[PDB]
Amino acid sequence: RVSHEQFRAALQLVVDPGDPRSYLDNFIKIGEGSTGIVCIATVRSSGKLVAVKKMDLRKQQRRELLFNEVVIMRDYQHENVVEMYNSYLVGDELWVVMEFLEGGALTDIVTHTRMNEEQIAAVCLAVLQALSVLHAQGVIHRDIKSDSILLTHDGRVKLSDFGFCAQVSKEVPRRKSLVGTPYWMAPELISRLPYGPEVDIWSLGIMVIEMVDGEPPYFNEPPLKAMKMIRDNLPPRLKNLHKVSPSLKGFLDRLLVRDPAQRATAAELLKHPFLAKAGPPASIVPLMRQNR
Questions:
Q1: In the chain, how many domains are there?
Q2: Could you write out the DSSP letters of every residue in the chain?
Q3: Same domain, 57 and 176
Q4: Residue 91's domain spans which residues?
Q5: Is 16 tagged catalytic?
Q6: What are residue 175's DSSP bridge partners?
Q7: Same domain, yes or no, for 69 and 38?
Q8: Which residue is catalytic, options 143, 147, 200, 213?
């Protein structure tokens, strides 16, 4: 009641004024995430399509993390990050009008076909380019997984869903919060150790297993049990090691390192020989549902 009204008023001071229903038509829902729904809408004057993320203030586990949408939009735009155009308070929801990634999410490719290493290397290179730039400015995404990687029709790869992100800096060197999606969570984060950008590197390792095997490890375990497993066990293994080149295997072994001090950084991984395999964005295009 009171808490909600108080929060609506806070958000209003940071978002753009007005209501984008005034310039948008034909909202059609295309998906849900952890923090709300995503629709496409048609820009009336142009006929172009944009995405609108709608997040109900009353349905957030940590309502203050909604500010992440504003911090990212304001400050950390980049070629491999979804362009955020404007944000608004529309009744009890935060709406973010953003770039529409019409190629959809990497999850729908990983669940339905088998990527080759040209393709996997293209995805990993693009993701690592985003992370290198984010991590150098102290931003940790904290929810790297195939659902957070979106594609353009011509196969360019962009990071999305920064709702769970946080900042580190000299004054706050490490984060402590239990955040992310259980199967992708880094072991030190499940163990409740102070952690840093290294956690996105482990999560990317898990997404590589998604790209190879179709699923993260322990995916048939309840989320609580899977976390315990990640906390306690040696790094997870591919379901079939013969299906990866020695190069991809060497690459994965620099990501899935339990000790975060020994895990490779995004900076280091950009130089890794596996990425020499990356094809151009055209290599990704045939993987998309409209093409398979």
A1: 2
A2: -HHHHHHHHHHHHHSPSS-GGGTEEEEEEEEE-SS-EEEEEEETTT--EEEEEEEEGGG-SSGGGGHHHHHHHHH---TTB--EEEEEEETTEEEEEE---TTEEHHHHHHHS---HHHHHHHHHHHHHHHHHHHHTTEE----SGGGEEE-TT--EEE---TT-EE--SSS--B----S-GGG--HHHHTT--B-THHHHHHHHHHHHHHHHSS-TTTTS-HHHHHHHHHHSS-PPPS-GGGS-HHHHHHHHHHS-SSTTTSPPHHHHTT-GGGGGPPPGGGTGGGSTTT-
A3: no
A4: 1-100
A5: no
A6: 195
A7: yes
A8: 143
Which parts are annotated binding residues? 30-38, 53, 99-101, 161-163
Q: Which residues sit in the known binding site for ATP?
A: 30-38, 53, 99-101, 161-163
Tokens of 131: 């992370």
